[PDB]
Design an enzyme around this catalytic site. Structure first.
Site, short mmCIF file in Angstrom:
data_model
loop_
_atom_site.label_atom_id
_atom_site.label_comp_id
_atom_site.label_asym_id
_atom_site.label_seq_id
_atom_site.Cartn_x
_atom_site.Cartn_y
_atom_site.Cartn_z
N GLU A 101 -3.52 13.53 0.93
CA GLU A 101 -4.80 13.06 1.44
C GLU A 101 -5.53 14.28 1.97
OE1 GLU A 101 -3.86 9.53 3.97
OE2 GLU A 101 -4.63 8.51 2.19
N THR B 274 -6.15 6.75 7.74
CA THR B 274 -6.70 6.96 6.40
C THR B 274 -6.68 5.69 5.55
OG1 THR B 274 -4.57 7.69 5.52
CG2 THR B 274 -6.08 9.40 6.40
N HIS C 238 5.42 7.07 6.69
CA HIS C 238 5.23 6.64 5.31
C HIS C 238 4.64 7.83 4.58
CE1 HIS C 238 1.38 6.12 7.41
NE2 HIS C 238 0.81 6.48 6.27
N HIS D 115 1.96 9.16 1.07
CA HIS D 115 0.87 8.88 0.14
C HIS D 115 1.23 9.81 -1.02
CE1 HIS D 115 -1.72 6.89 3.12
NE2 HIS D 115 -1.14 7.70 3.97
N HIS E 51 0.85 -1.19 0.00
CA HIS E 51 0.00 0.00 0.00
C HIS E 51 0.89 1.25 0.00
CE1 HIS E 51 -2.96 -2.99 0.99
NE2 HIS E 51 -2.13 -3.39 1.94
N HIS F 140 3.34 10.98 6.64
CA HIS F 140 2.63 10.71 7.89
C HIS F 140 3.61 10.09 8.89
CE1 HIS F 140 -1.56 10.44 5.82
NE2 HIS F 140 -1.16 11.71 5.99
#
Ligand SMILES: O=C(NO)c1ccccc1
Ligand SMILES: [Zn+2]
EC number: 4.2.1.1
Length: 257
Positions: free
Chosen positions: A103, A195, A91, A93, A61, A116
């Site tokens: 996000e 999230t 990590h 996104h 992911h 994050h």
């Protein structure tokens, strides 16, 4: 299982994880004109000098840089937080294009990516017990825009080729997360959730106003990662972000005037 594709993406998560349509889901759009300065907020304290990174993992992911949290080292405190929160992992996104990836959004503006840094409330003993509490986690969110390279991120970028596919990990010691922080610690804060599934509503979000800039070359390497495992058709790890959710009965507070 869940992912970010047309058939298993964000719009599908609610079937296995009903809380996806809960009362304090993340991310949200941060309407800067509606956010209110909160004088009750104490100064924010990010103490990462003793941070001990252990390894980096591609979990299918995103990729997590994990830290040794068996001792009181890298901690986040102050601000809207009560007590001490310990850094366990960080990590990002990101998107398939520079125009999307984050996000949280600021006045509907989407950044190229979002970092994050995940922390758990030490009053609960460990991460597992913390995620069963409404104030068990604190996540420091930092926006990334494409411009000048971020020197402190290059070590992360250079190890990605070694964890290209789901399940792969690599030793990743002595990485200093202080190199990922912007100059200002001005931030917005609100009560929210993870999230990604299980989307637990145990998070106090602290989103920094100042983004850090990373180079086009650095984010391009993020996009070379794979969601798939080794020996499977290649599906580029891009657009692994959940869109803004309903703010519902919440208020976003600002740490600055
Ligand atoms: O930011 C997160 N998911 O994107 C997250 C936050 C807390 C715990 C696990 C994951
Ligand atoms: Zn995240």
């Amino acid at each position: 299982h869940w992912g970010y594709g047309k058939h298993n993406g964000p719009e599908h998560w609610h079937k296995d994880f009903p809380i996806a349509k809960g009362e304090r889901q993340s991310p949200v759009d941060i309407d800067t004109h509606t956010a209110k300065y909160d004088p009750s907020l104490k100064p924010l304290s990010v103490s990462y000098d003793q941070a001990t990174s252990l390894r980096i993992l591609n979990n299918g992911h995103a990729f997590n840089v994990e830290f040794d949290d068996s001792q009181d080292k890298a901690v986040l405190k102050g601000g809207p937080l009560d007590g001490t929160y310990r850094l366990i992992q960080f990590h990002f996104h990101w998107g398939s294009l520079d125009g999307q990836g984050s996000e949280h959004t600021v006045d509907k503006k989407k950044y190229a990516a979002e970092l994050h840094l995940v922390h758990w409330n030490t009053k609960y003993g460990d991460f597992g017990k913390a995620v069963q509490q409404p104030d068990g986690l604190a996540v420091l969110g930092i926006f990334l825009k494409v411009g000048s390279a971020k020197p402190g991120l290059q070590k992360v970028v250079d190890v990605l080729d070694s964890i290209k596919t789901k399940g792969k990990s690599a030793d990743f010691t002595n990485f200093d997360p202080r190199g990922l922080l912007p100059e200002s610690l001005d931030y917005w804060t609100y009560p929210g959730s993870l999230t990604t599934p299980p989307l637990l509503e145990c998070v106090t979000w602290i989103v920094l106003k100042e983004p850090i800039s990373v180079s086009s070359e650095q984010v391009l390497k993020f996009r070379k990662l794979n969601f798939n495992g080794e020996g499977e058709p290649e599906e580029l790890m891009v657009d692994n972000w959940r869109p803004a959710q309903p703010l519902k009965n919440r208020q976003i507070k600002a740490s600055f005037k």
